[PDB]
């Protein structure tokens, strides 16, 4: 009467065991089994220094690929106030608003391959190819690993990086509307996705949800405003939301947000104090002696980086929101270099709490559509 939907899990985000009753074709009750990917970072996080712990974050974080280092650098640099310049802050803003894209693609593409869009799977990978070159040439191998040191960042991104957005920077803009005209076309696209897994706003805030999946009910709880994160807020933007919260609302809110990414990028590349990197490159040779360059502004590193630094009792929380969902790393402010206790608060662990309450009296196909639209991944969940 009950069968598991397979630990092999013929889905996007890895391994998920779903034990569910089956009355021939329709289901009555389903249950998830989690815990199969225990990265156990909460253990090692005490028996390590900072720099040896730096590449650890983009390991259980390879879909987001960047939304783990924001808070992982907040604790070392933003807590003890090792003053981060506003230019390096704008560089980090470029990073974060490109990771918004890194998430939008790696959801919508697979979301297209879950909803019923059979062809565009390779299309979005062909679009994403350029972000690979960017992440490679910026700091690291493929996921740009080790782009956040403590006193700033690893190294200012090279010259062929910042001023060279233009190709994808105006390509994807005209490319967005492709998906918007394709989704409203062939209502078989739309018929199966409309009117499934609907959720309200009061339960969206009562269940602890977050992200565009929650913003899609007129909640607009977008945490890209509530925090003076590295004094980023000089830029302008446009809140992305909807007023339903269901799967189609999820698609709408996650297709209407990436248009702001390149907008913020355009704000930065010309609004960064250094602007492009070749600009600051050709400017630090005529005024090598002294200027606002290399001062509290225009400096990648403030003080020496090293695995030696003591801490006081200061247990600070940040609810840094990713387009998948919120994230937080609370930690008992300890007097020792490495602290007593570590903690993570991922969106995946705060998303599936409604999962068994989502698929109610539905069919297997309905479960497939809801689980493809919910924008969920493992890695973040287990930690």
């Amino acid at each position: 009467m009950i069968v598991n939907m397979g630990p092999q899990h013929p889905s996007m985000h890895g391994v998920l065991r779903l034990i569910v009753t089956l009355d021939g074709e329709d289901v009555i009750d389903c249950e998830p089994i989690l815990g199969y990917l225990h990265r156990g970072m909460e253990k090692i996080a005490e028996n390590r220094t900072i720099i040896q712990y730096l590449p650890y974050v983009t390991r259980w974080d390879y879909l987001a690929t960047m939304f783990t280092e924001a808070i992982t650098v907040n604790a070392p640099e933003f807590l003890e106030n090792i003053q981060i310049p506003q230019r390096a802050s704008y560089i980090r803003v470029i990073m974060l608003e490109l990771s918004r894209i890194a998430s939008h693609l790696l959801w919508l593409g697979p979301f297209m391959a879950d909803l019923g869009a059979q062809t565009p799977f390779f299309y979005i990978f062909r679009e994403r190819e350029l972000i690979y070159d960017l992440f490679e040439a910026a700091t690291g191998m493929r996921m740009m690993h080790n782009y956040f040191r403590i006193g700033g960042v690893a190294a200012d991104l090279p010259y062929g990086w910042i001023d060279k957005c233009l190709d994808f920077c105006d390509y994807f803009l005209r490319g967005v509307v492709e998906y918007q005209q394709l989704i409203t076309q062939n209502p078989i696209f739309l018929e199966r996705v409309e009117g499934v897994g609907f959720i309200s706003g009061e339960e969206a805030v009562n269940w602890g949800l977050s992200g565009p999946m929650l913003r899609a009910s007129g909640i607009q709880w977008d945490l890209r405003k509530v925090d003076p994160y590295e004094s980023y807020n000089q830029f302008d933007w446009k809140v992305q939301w909807q007023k339903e919260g269901d799967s189609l609302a999820r698609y709408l809110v996650r297709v209407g947000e990436m248009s702001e990414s390149i907008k913020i990028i355009q704000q930065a590349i010309e609004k960064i104090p250094g602007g492009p990197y070749e600009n600051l490159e050709v400017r630090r040779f005529k005024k090598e002696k002294n200027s606002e360059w290399n001062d509290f502004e225009y400096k990648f590193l403030g003080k020496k980086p090293s695995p030696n630094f003591e801490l006081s009792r200061q247990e600070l929380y940040v609810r840094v929101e990713a387009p998948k969902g919120e994230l937080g790393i609370y930690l008992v402010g300890d007097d020792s270099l490495f602290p007593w206790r570590w903690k993570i608060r991922p969106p995946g662990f705060i998303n599936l709490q409604i999962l068994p309450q989502l698929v109610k009296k539905m069919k297997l196909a309905d479960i497939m559509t809801i689980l493809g639209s919910i924008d969920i991944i493992m890695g973040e969940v287990d930690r």
Partner: protein
Amino acid sequence: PMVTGFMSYGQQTIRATRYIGQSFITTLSHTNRLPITIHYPYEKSITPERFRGRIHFEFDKCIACEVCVRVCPIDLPVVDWRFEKDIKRKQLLNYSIDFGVCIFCGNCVEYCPTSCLSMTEEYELSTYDRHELNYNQIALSRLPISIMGDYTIQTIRNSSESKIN
């Protein structure tokens, strides 16, 4: 009733067709497009000047800073000094790099005294057993693949490395 159905049965089909034929003639330029995707394996991608491959070892650049363990994510290599009496710095005898247990951090590349820890980029690790990975001083060089130094390679630059448009 039926008159509303006798009026809307053509409307449903005409919407279906206006969508289907439109998508068909739109993807027409896609099924016979003029893009050329990734070529054969003899056409690897271009690599700019910031990445990490096979790290390198030395005997005249690791002054015995010994930070070898204080950089890798699991304090990977050994530390070995064996009772020298030249001045005070005991020698460098025992060591073994093992990429099977190094996760490409190698962060000492940034804090090493004299350019010792460096980067390369190949990957033909025909591992028939885990215990065959003792990377000592010089054969790590091996004058690697040298993409431009091969006679069967003509690599065009990718999107972010070619020109605009």
